[PDB]
């Protein structure tokens, strides 16, 4: 599926939360400097791209 | 009103590994990454002010490229902050009130006193409700207002040993005032502790202003009564606090699996 989260977009599949984050930490950039984890603009749910 | 202390009359110490904050809003797990920004240089001379409290000063602290403030204080006698350049109702300036009830964030054009501080507050019933007020007393040409949670932890800590330490970082980039806070438990009672911790962004105010000088506010009862000994008891040594300046370099950092800041190395140190 394609996704657009308030600006930045992407295309892939989505997975439930597995990590803890930090309550103002919402992005999930990896060692490859690519976005792969983000939280919902409407709810506090971690999702993995 | 305005009370100025006519009779007016800096113990350099060391900060080991303090002043490390998350440089952005991304999460990296168990990797290493380096950025170039304004941190505290490691092992620098930091100015510990007059370690008494009887004693009240009106110093001149210049602001230049971000300020790291750190002052543990029981019962939270430290309550406010001043940021500005001219302080005589010429241009805009910023004021912070951190009392127990709320937090007040002003950008105003106040007629600041040479030593802004509240004196004496008279009698209601064994309690603290303020009666006297002398910090600006005029020049109220502002229509700005801001309410949030008060950053400081609560008051009336009467333990013999030091228990809590409060550290803040104020950064002025592109008129986008960034405040980094950490309330930490320490029990060693000796200056700046030797340890490693992270700082977190919680307050971001986009305003745009020029700052060259800064101060801070206290609040107490010096006499508790107007007629007897109103204001003559104090001299220029107000309180003890740590102020550090910031320098731009590269500060390569290591993350853990939890994403918490674990270690950082300064590139141009050794």
UniProtKB/Swiss-Prot annotation, chain B:
UniProt-annotated glycosylation sites, renumbered to this chain: 4, 45, 99, 125, 141, 210, 258
Mutagenesis or variant effect for residue 36 to H: In strain: Omicron/EG.5.1
Disulfide bonds: 2-113, 108-142
Result when mutating residue 191 to G: In strain: Beta/B.1.351
Effect caused by changing residue 198 to V: In strain: 20A.EU1
Putative superantigen as annotated region, ranges: 256-270
Region listing for Disordered, in residue ranges: 119-140, 149-161, 222-238
Domain BetaCoV S1-NTD: 1-270
Source species, domain of life: Viruses
Role this protein plays: Attaches the virion to the cell membrane by interacting with host receptor, initiating the infection. The major receptor is host ACE2. When S2/S2' has been cleaved, binding to the receptor triggers direct fusion at the cell membrane. When S2/S2' has not been cleaved, binding to the receptor results in internalization of the virus by endocytosis using host TFRC and GRM2 and leading to fusion of the virion membrane with the host endosomal membrane. Alternatively, may use NRP1/NRP2 and integrin as entry receptors.
Subunit structure: Binds to host ACE2. RBD also interacts with the N-linked glycan on 'Asn-90' of ACE2. Cleavage of S generates a polybasic C-terminal sequence on S1 that binds to host Neuropilin-1 (NRP1) and Neuropilin-2 (NRP2) receptors. Interacts with host integrin alpha-5/beta-1 (ITGA5:ITGB1) and with ACE2 in complex with integrin alpha-5/beta-1 (ITGA5:ITGB1). May interact via cytoplasmic c-terminus with M protein. May interact (via N-terminus) with host bilirubin and biliverdin, thereby preventing antibody binding to the SARS-CoV-2 spike NTD via an allosteric mechanism.
Full protein name: Spike protein S1
Whole sequence portion shown: 14 to 294 of 1273
């Amino acid at each position: 599926v394609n996704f657009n989260f308030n600006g930045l977009t992407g295309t892939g599949v989505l997975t439930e939360s597995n990590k803890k984050f930090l309550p103002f930490q919402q992005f999930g950039r990896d060692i490859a400097d690519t976005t792969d984890a983000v939280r919902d603009p409407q709810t506090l749910e971690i999702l993995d791209i | 009103q305005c009370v100025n202390l006519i009779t007016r009359t800096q113990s350099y110490t060391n900060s080991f590994t303090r002043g490390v904050y998350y440089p952005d809003k991304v999460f990296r797990s168990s990797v290493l990454h380096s950025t170039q920004d304004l941190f505290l240089p490691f092992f620098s001379n930091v100015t510990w002010f007059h370690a008494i409290h009887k004693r009240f000063d009106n110093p001149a602290l210049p602001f230049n490229d971000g300020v790291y403030f750190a002052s543990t204080e029981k019962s939270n006698i430290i309550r406010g902050w001043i940021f500005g350049t001219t302080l005589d109702s010429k241009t805009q300036s910023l004021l912070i009130v951190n009392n127990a009830t709320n937090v007040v964030i002003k950008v105003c054009e106040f007629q600041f006193c040479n030593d802004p501080f509240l004196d004496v507050y008279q009698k209601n019933n064994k309690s603290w409700m303020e009666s006297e007020f002398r910090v600006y007393s005029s020049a109220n040409n502002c229509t700005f207002e801001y309410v949030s949670q008060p950053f400081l932890m609560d008051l009336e800590g009467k333990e013999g040993n030091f228990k809590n330490l409060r550290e803040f970082v104020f950064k002025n980039i592109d008129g986008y005032f960034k405040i980094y806070s950490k309330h930490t438990p320490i029990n060693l009672e000796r200056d700046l502790p030797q340890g490693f911790s992270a700082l977190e962004p919680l307050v971001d105010l986009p305003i745009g202003i020029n700052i060259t000088r800064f101060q801070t506010l206290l609040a107490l009862h010096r006499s508790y009564l107007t007629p007897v000994d109103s204001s003559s008891g104090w001299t220029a040594g107000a309180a003890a606090y740590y102020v550090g300046y910031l320098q731009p370099r590269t500060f390569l950092l290591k993350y853990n699996e939890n994403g918490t800041i674990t270690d950082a190395v300064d590139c141009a140190l050794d």
